[PDB]
């Protein structure tokens, strides 16, 4: 047909930016479009499974999660669960992570299979707040950008954003809406279930909440897949009779699926001009909580800066994490470089970088799961005056007359090789300026030339004054230092792969 | 769940838990459940506190014998501990959880003096990347148990030497009227008796206590003990002969026969078996099921859902194999010079490599990087057994080879492999035995070290155990089929050929010669071929009452064949040699085993029981890995548990013996150094160490190493001396320490530092197997093989031949010094006939042997004779098929070109030889290639071209006789060369 021979050409588009947004769109415009969705996206996964090729199952695998997700209704005589659990049942014996990751779909699924719309109720009632006592969840987005540096398109995102458009009541419906409609299809009434809702006060509101949501939870918690669906049915009908709206369900006359969305997460914003994430605590004045740092090319170190430097300091001071646990987004408007070289379907989705932004933002975190570590050097810095100190930097290092400008001395360093077998040296210089350049490093003599070194550890003469700089700092200077020893070294920053 | 009473060490008494586990619940995660438990239940906490799960081990008893569950990543429902219990209707069973132990004293002490005897510490533990060594250790204690709990106390304390062969023609006629003189010693009372050559010891002494009964004072025997109450004796040697055997089938008296020399025998008392005792074993029994994973049907993926799999088959997986390979670093570049250098991994399977692989070029620095996937075109379920991942670096500007390194893609446990391996390379300064070896170099400090990453993976990849399960051909064919079986073992089968045989694969299992040739075609890369051979050979009745041909189950035993299966039926046929048929082919049975993949195998436990059963065969077997552990570091480990394995059960009497010897070995080492290290102060300084030496508590009773039952006893100090050598030998000579012996002669031995005497102990196990070959015959070409070993480093200890010397000596080239020789050492005629019969009948001999093997062409000076004509070799380090030089057919009455009644009888004796050992081509081709490789094709293709393996009999004995006249026109020439390049 038309409208299938268009989605196979758009799912190539996002398999190879907005791409995958439009993909979305597209096949939102109907619920049947999902259905033929899952069977084009399945097929491509047994093409990988055939021949064994691994940078096109990471993409897939998100794919078939959004989709499922979004999915508002499967029909008994189609069992395309079954065909996508078969298909990912023979990844267990592939390499980490790709078994790793097609467990988590099994589970996925089977979550699905037993109990349909467990996953979609899951989490907009976190993202909302409005759990129930049984099972209480909640997930919190809040943003970081500077409108100083920030251009004001995004800005006007999390203006957006911010902007409180569902209201509990309003969500408390919407979620029952999806509820019944994932389980009998066609045959609710969804325009009978709208209006006889609307006059529900928000008290029943939440206990016919509770009363739903309870039952899907047991529900996955039984053996055979169509018992489980059975008894929810069961369930479910026995929940719309005692409601009031009996009739409004299992109506002979099939109706038209109507595509539910996902409504928008409780999202907030303030000013980061500064970049220690103080405000964070400030903010305050295991349930999830959504950091967005924005980030541009030279706020890219200090980003990092004040990023591990917080992550650390919760590490042992932890104040944040007796509330929530934290999770971080990062947002272009160096760590850049680093993801593009190492997840490429970040790249191609956040990197490129209500409208398209927040929608794409909001599928951004949704649905992201996999950390990342970067790379940190660690620096211990003693004085003359008996005080020592810790610091982190990842740029580089630079001291001496070229570094005052910008904003003799024992060496000692041991370069090793991949193998662990490697070469201390003790080769004390004098220079008139000293440069760390960025994994191992690459040390700067300007007497000039540069050396390959892994760690390295410089001693002062006699109390001689001069000022130190980390990642071309230009407020915290260190000056009149007498010995500085670098060596390579949850909160992480997401990304997709 | 199942469940488990668990025995709790702490109480009023001992006090026990029941536990419920799963099934299919890790061993680890029971020890943990267990400690919850007991700290739930325990009415101390605190001693349940201290402790660990991981100090503690479980106990169980199977009829009476302690088993410990050595192996920790496994499942509960594996353990071969609840299968002996529901057979036997126990549940829940009891497992002791007894706390570990440190070793004591004792303990400690006996494995020190097991260390020096190896000359290598088995509990080292340090250059090993895997536990199979010390899984071997602990599961080769049930073969030695039973066999040390099997034995026979008398006759294993005095080891009779019996064989079963039938007397030869030439010793049929030397027992006149069935008839055979003994000389019974009885302290100064020396008398003959004469019995029936077909009667037992325990009857010889009968008749002995019957006749001399009234003359029985002047004997001297005690009059309480009667004929029971002793045993004869060799006199002068510590060989006893006891049994019930004919008094015709001992090797004594079979040697004496042969020498014309009448059998001296001297009535003693038994030898007490309480001397043999062994100390009680240490550790427990390990679990008997530790090599089995399961079938096909229980390790797969398919049939089960993620809920409950645990273990993923590997004939499961489907995708390519594939490796990483990260790169290179040689600490100091060895030489600076504008060269390349790419790495390759190649996949293999006894020198068969499945597919390659390699990496681009790049410049040769102190540390190379690449970080590079290499994906093979062998599937991941296509991996046999016994796949050998081999790295190899190679250099280039061809290509020169510089290191290389192996790897086991599937361990000892069938479990692929999975992580980050660095392993560093061995250096070569076409293949070798050296070059299939899975030891990595511990030279960690100046050699190169490769990175390999090799995927992981959620679950364990176990390779299942196969499962035993259930019109003539056109004449063409079969006659096609019987030319391929019937070719000699070297000529390979081409792949025609090969679909012959494998398409004809139940036609030829019934024709056992054809096993080398039948399993040589299967394709080993796929895994229904091997699934097929296994349902083929699980009906071989054939093969399991066709008669031995060492030959076939040598050619089994070699490289190619890295099967589980296929060695050990070979192993099974060998289960059937005896003691002097296997004393024969020790050295190449343990030079063999540098070619079993793995450790435990059943070519190592067969060398240790039939050690463990018989002294002789374990004092030889003592000597041949001893000098393996000390000079081959690619196979250090292997052989020093194997010796271990041993020692603990030979005896605390062999035991003392092994140390005696190992030490006087030490001492006369060191003398080595010293004169080497720097003239009649060189004869001098060599008497004050030898006469400190002696003053140096040199035990003052040794068995020979080359001789169990000779025991050399105090130093002789004026004929010792230092031979005009550059590596200036020990000429030592000792005397015998028994009372009884009935000559005063000494006992002569080299001792010799400076080189490699491994080769030296083939070519001459080689010869003394062809002399019993030329015996099968009824033939007596009278080789002289000595004895030799190799010891240690660069050391052997060579045995001294009595009133001989060296030709080059017996012309310091005059062509009629050799016959004038010998007239005057032995004027009288009746001798000098006697004399040059002897020096014919052995001139052939090794006109025919040094030809055969390729070692014909040789200087005059490495050939000697002894006083009785007999000549022989010695000193085994444009081409003439021997050296028969002029003088030597001048001793048989021949000059120019006359024919001497000798002349001929040399011809017809060399002849009817060679013709004798064409009979067993395979044989002398087997023997051979196993000897090169695992010694020092082209090169063996010399063992054809000259055994005559082709042709038939007439083109053969026209053949060798076309030899022996070249020979008689090279005259002296040949042997100019030699001595004109030595002196030059
Ligand atoms: N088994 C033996 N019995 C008696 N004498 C022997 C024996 N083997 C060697 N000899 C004597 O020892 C000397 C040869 O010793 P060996 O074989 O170590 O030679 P080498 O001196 O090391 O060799 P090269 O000729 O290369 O200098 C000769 O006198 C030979 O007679």
Redo the contacts between chains.
């Keep these: 047909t038309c409208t299938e021979d268009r989605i196979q050409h758009a799912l190539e588009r996002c398999l190879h930016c907005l791409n995958c947004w439009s993909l979305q769109e597209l096949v939102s415009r109907d619920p049947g479009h999902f259905l033929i969705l899952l069977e084009q996206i399945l097929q491509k996964t047994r093409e990988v499974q055939e021949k064994?090729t691994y940078d096109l199952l990471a993409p897939l695998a998100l794919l078939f999660y959004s989709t499922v997700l979004c999915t508002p209704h499967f029909p008994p005589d189609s069992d395309l669960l079954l065909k996508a659990a078969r298909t990912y049942?023979?990844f267990?014996?592939?390499?980490?992570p790709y078994?790793?990751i097609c467990?988590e779909l099994?589970?996925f699924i089977d979550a699905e299979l037993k109990a349909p719309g467990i996953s979609y109720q899951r989490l907009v009632r976190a993202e909302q707040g409005l759990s129930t006592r049984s099972h209480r969840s909640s997930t919190v987005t809040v943003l970081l950008l500077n409108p100083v540096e920030v251009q004001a398109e995004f800005l006007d995102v999390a203006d957006k954003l911010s902007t409180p458009g569902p209201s509990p009541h309003s969500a408390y419906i919407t979620l029952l809406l999806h509820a019944f409609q994932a389980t009998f299809g066609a045959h609710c009434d969804l325009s009978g279930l709208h209006r006889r809702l609307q006059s529900k006060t928000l008290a029943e509101l939440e206990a016919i909440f509770t009363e739903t949501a309870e039952a899907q939870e047991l529900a996955s918690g039984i053996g055979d897949a169509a018992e489980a669906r059975q008894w929810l049915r069961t369930k479910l009908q026995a929940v719309g009779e005692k409601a009031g709206f009996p009739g409004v369900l299992d109506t002979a006359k099939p109706g038209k699926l109507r595509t539910i969305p996902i409504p928008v997460a409780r999202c907030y914003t303030y000013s980061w001009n500064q970049d220690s994430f103080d405000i964070l605590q400030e903010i305050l004045l295991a349930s999830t909580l959504r950091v967005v740092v924005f980030g541009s090319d030279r706020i890219s170190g200090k980003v990092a800066r004040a990023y591990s430097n917080l992550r650390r300091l919760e590490n042992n001071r932890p104040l944040l994490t007796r509330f929530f646990k934290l999770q971080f987004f990062y947002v272009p408007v160096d760590i850049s470089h680093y993801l593009g070289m190492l997840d490429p379907w970040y790249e191609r989705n956040v990197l490129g970088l209500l409208p398209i932004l927040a929608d794409m933002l909001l599928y951004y975190c949704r649905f992201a799961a996999r950390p990342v570590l970067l790379q940190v050097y660690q620096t211990e810095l003693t004085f003359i005056t008996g005080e020592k100190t810790t610091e982190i930097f990842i740029h580089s290092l630079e001291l001496g007359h070229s570094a005052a400008t910008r904003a003799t001395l024992q060496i000692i360093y041991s370069k090793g090789?991949?193998?662990?077998?490697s070469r201390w040296s003790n080769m004390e210089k004098l220079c008139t300026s000293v440069n760390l350049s960025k994994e191992a490093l690459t040390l700067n003599l300007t007497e000039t030339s540069q050396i390959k070194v892994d760690k390295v550890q410089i001693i002062g003469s006699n109390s001689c004054p001069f000022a130190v700089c980390l990642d071309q700092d230009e407020r915290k200077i260190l000056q009149s230092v007498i010995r500085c020893e670098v060596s390579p070294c949850c909160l992480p920053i997401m990304t997709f792969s | 769940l199942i469940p488990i009473e668990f025995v709790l060490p702490t109480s009023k008494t001992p006090e026990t838990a029941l536990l419920h586990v799963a099934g299919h619940g890790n061993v680890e995660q029971m020890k943990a459940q267990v400690w919850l438990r007991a700290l739930e239940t325990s009415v101390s906490a605190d001693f349940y506190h201290r402790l660990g799960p991981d100090h503690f081990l479980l106990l169980y008893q199977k009829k009476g014998q302690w088993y410990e569950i050595y192996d920790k990543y496994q499942v509960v429902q594996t353990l071969d501990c609840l299968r002996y219990w529901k057979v036997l209707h126990r549940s829940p069973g009891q497992i002791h959880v007894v706390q570990r132990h440190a070793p004591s004293e004792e303990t400690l002490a006996f494995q020190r003096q097991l260390n020096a005897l190896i000359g290598y510490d088995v509990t080292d533990v340090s250059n090993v990347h895997d536990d199979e060594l010390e899984f071997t250790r602990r599961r080769l204690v049930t073969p030695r148990m039973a066999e040390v709990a099997g034995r026979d106390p008398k006759l294993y304390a005095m080891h009779p030497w019996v064989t079963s062969k039938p007397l030869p023609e030439y010793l049929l006629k030397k027992i006149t009227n069935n008839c055979v003189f003994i000389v019974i010693h009885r302290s100064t009372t020396s008398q003959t008796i004469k019995v029936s050559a077909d009667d037992t010891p325990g009857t010889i002494l009968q008749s002995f206590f019957t006749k001399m009964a009234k003359k029985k004072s002047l004997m001297d025997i005690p009059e309480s003990q009667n004929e029971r109450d002793f045993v004869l004796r060799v006199c002068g040697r510590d060989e006893y002969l006891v049994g019930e055997t004919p008094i015709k089938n001992f090797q004594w008296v079979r040697q004496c026969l042969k020498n014309g020399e009448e059998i001296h025998l001297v009535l003693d008392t038994p030898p007490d078996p309480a001397l043999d005792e062994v100390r009680k074993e240490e550790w427990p029994l390990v679990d008997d099921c530790t090599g089995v994973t399961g079938y096909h049907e229980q390790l797969t993926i398919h049939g089960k859902d993620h809920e409950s799999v645990f273990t993923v088959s590997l004939w499961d997986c489907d995708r390519k194999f594939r490796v990483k390979i990260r790169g290179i670093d040689i600490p100091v570049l060895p030489r600076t010079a504008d060269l390349t250098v790419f790495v390759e991994a190649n996949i293999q399977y006894g020198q068969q490599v499945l597919c390659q692989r390699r990496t681009s070029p790049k410049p040769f620095t102190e540390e190379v990087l690449w970080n590079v996937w290499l994906e093979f075109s062998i599937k991941i379920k296509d991996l046999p057994k016994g796949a050998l991942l081999n790295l190899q670096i190679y250099c280039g500007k061809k290509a020169q080879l510089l290191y290389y390194v192996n790897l086991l893609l599937i361990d000892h446990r069938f479990l692929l492999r999975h992580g980050e391996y660095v392993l560093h390379m061995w250096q070569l300064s076409s293949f070798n035995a050296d070059k299939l070896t899975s030891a990595t170099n511990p030279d960690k400090e100046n050699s190169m070290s490769i990175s390999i990453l090799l995927d992981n993976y959620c679950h364990p990849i176990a390779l299942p155990k196969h499962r035993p399960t259930p019109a003539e051909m056109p004449n063409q064919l079969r006659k096609q089929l019987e030319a391929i079986i019937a070719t000699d073992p070297l000529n390979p089968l081409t792949a025609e050929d090969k679909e012959l045989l494998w398409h004809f694969r139940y036609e030829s299992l019934k024709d056992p010669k054809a096993y080398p040739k039948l399993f040589s075609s299967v394709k080993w890369g796929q895994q229904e071929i091997v699934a097929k051979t296994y349902q083929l050979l699980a009906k071989r009745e054939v093969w399991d009452q066709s008669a031995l041909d060492v030959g076939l189950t040598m050619q089994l035993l070699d490289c190619n064949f890295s099967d589980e299966n296929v060695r050990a039926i070979a192993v099974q046929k060998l289960e059937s040699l005896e003691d002097d048929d296997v004393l024969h082919y020790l050295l190449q049975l343990v030079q063999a085993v540098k070619f079993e993949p793995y450790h435990d195998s059943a070519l190592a436990r067969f060398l240790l029981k039939r050690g463990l059963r018989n002294k002789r065969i374990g004092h030889f077997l003592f000597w041949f890995l001893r000098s393996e552990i000390a000079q081959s570091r690619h196979y250090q480990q292997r052989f020093a548990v194997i010796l271990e394995a041993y020692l603990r059960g030979c005896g605390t009497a062999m035991l003392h013996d092994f140390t005696q010897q190992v030490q006087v070995i030490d001492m006369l080492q060191k003398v080595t150094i010293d004169i080497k290290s720097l003239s009649s102060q060189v004869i001098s300084q060599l008497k004050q160490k030898l006469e400190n030496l002696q003053n140096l508590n040199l035990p003052q009773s040794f068995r020979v190493p080359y001789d169990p039952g000779l025991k050399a006893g105090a130093l002789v100090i004026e004929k010792c001396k230092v031979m005009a050598s550059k590596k200036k030998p020990l000429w030592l000579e000792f005397k015998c320490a028994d009372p009884t012996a009935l000559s005063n002669e000494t006992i002569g031995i080299i001792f010799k530092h400076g080189d490699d005497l491994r080769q030296d102990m083939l070519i001459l196990q080689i010869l003394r197997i062809m002399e019993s070959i030329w015996e099968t015959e009824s033939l007596d070409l009278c080789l002289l093989p000595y004895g030799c070993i190799s010891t240690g480093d660069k050391i052997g200890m060579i045995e001294i031949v009595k009133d001989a010397t060296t030709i080059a000596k017996i012309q310091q080239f005059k062509d009629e010094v050799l016959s004038h020789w010998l007239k005057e050492k032995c004027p009288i005629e009746e001798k000098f006939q006697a004399a040059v019969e002897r020096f014919v009948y052995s001139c052939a001999g090794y006109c025919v042997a040094t030809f055969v093997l390729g070692i014909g062409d040789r200087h005059n000076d490495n050939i000697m004779i002894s006083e009785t004509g007999n000549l022989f070799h010695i000193d085994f380090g444009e081409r003439v098929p021997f050296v028969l030089t002029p003088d030597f057919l001048f001793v048989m009455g021949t000059s120019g070109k006359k024919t001497s009644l000798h002349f001929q009888k040399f011809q017809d004796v060399c002849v009817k030889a060679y013709l004798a050992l064409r009979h067993h081509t395979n044989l002398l081709i087997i023997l051979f290639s196993m000897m090169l490789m695992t010694g020092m094709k082209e090169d063996i293709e010399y063992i054809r071209d000259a055994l005559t393996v082709g042709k038939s009999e007439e083109d053969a004995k026209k053949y060798f006789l076309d030899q022996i006249e070249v020979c008689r026109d090279k005259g002296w020439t040949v042997q100019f060369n030699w001595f004109l390049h030595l002196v030059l």
């Design positions: 064994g049942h023979r267990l014996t592939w390499p980490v078994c790793s467990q099994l589970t090789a991949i193998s662990g077998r």
